[PDB]
Design a protein around this nucleic acid. Structure first.
Length: 156
RNA sequence: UGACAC
């Protein structure tokens, strides 16, 4: 069975998160928080109240593989210092700082070959690895991704 | 409005 995690997959909204470097994803799991473009933080903040739960799926541009997924624990923060994100070329911190708490359901990576049979109809019907940051994935599509993640038992 | 698949 999928343990208590299944409780989210029955009604949660899934979101495709991208990153320009593996360092932002690695830093986000080391901090237990995340940040993204202000148009995406808005979609995640509004999805938080309208859904039973929100799930953020992590990915890197050059990797094409998923680095993990985590449940949005809270809305974006403000009035305090931001996280030390690794800003890629042409990026600036002014688009960030809306840092939100997240709960890592799995720290492990997952190659797209396991999810190759999946596609997002809430998009151009393209595979789950394509599409921009903040793209909303279908309820049952993103659910299936959570079922095909490997166990994090490699950590200990 | 600024982290698509390569």
């Amino acid at each position: 069975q999928t343990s208590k995690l299944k409780s989210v997959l029955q009604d949660a909204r899934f979101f495709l998160i991208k990153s320009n470097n593996h360092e932002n994803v690695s830093l986000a799991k080391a901090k237990g928080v995340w940040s993204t473009l202000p148009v995406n933080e808005k979609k995640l903040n509004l999805a938080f109240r309208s859904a039973r739960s929100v799930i953020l799926i992590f990915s890197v541009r050059e990797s094409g593989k998923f680095q993990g997924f985590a449940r949005l624990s809270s809305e974006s923060h403000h009035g305090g210092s931001p996280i030390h994100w690794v800003l890629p070329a042409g990026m600036s911190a002014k688009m960030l700082g809306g840092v939100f708490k997240i709960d890592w359901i799995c720290r492990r990576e997952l190659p797209f070959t396991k999810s190759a049979h999946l596609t997002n109809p809430w998009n151009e019907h393209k595979p789950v690895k394509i599409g921009r940051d903040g793209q909303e994935i279908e309820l049952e599509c993103g659910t299936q991704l959570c079922l095909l993640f490997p166990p994090d038992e490699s950590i200990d």
